[PDB]
Ligand SMILES: [Ca+2]
Ligand SMILES: [Ca+2]
Ligand SMILES: [Ca+2]
């Protein structure tokens with residue numbers, strides 16, 4: 249089964265990736281509503297998910313380059329504001345928001 | 361409990377910081393079953409969340425609880441040199457006390 253754990257400190261996606269990979273896990277990528285809720289359970293605040301549209305704008309993939317199926321975008325998202333928002337966070341209501349990969353948020357790691 | 365191993369080596373203070381960052385702790389086997397599980401996730405010698413830093417030869421977990429189950433390698437713990445107050449799980453599953461300043465892999469434990 250997948251197990252999700254939340255970080256205590258906030259950091260940009262690249263550091264979030266490094267943190268989860270340090271324990272041989274990955275940044276949490278919910279594949280369905282059950283997993284999305286499981287991530288909500290552990291994230292006490294806005295937290296990074298392992299999804300990006302860095303390759304092609306508006307084509308969201310997990311960190312292994314696998315195009316995602318399930319999405320739970322907050323109304324109005326993804327909006328790619330300004331210079332670009334190519335990373336994704338799980339808001340406190342469980343919905344998603346695309347944000348700059350360089351911005352800092354808690355991270356939820358996934359292990360199985 | 362879920363056990364995960366790090367890929368890089370680091371001293372105990374950094375190991376504690378890593379496990380704590382994801383709200384866990386350095387793995388502390390409470391019986392032979394947990395000891396084997398940690399051994400299996402660790403690909404090389406790794407730190408356990410046990411030390412005798414507070415009182416020499418009184419081994420406790422990182423929350424101050426004295427440990428009951430132990431699996432010391434023959435001749436251990438020997439507190440050699442200027443002192444060894446940290447503990448590692450060897451590749452055969454037995455334990456060895458080592459300097460906390462030394463670098464080893466870390467196995468984190470989560471509930
Ligand atoms: Ca984008
Ligand atoms: Ca947005
Ligand atoms: Ca000692």
Ligand SMILES: [Ca+2]
Pocket residue numbers: 436437438439440444456457458
């Ligand atoms: Ca020793």
Ligand SMILES: [Cl-]
Pocket residue numbers: 443444445446458459460461
């Ligand atoms: Cl020491």
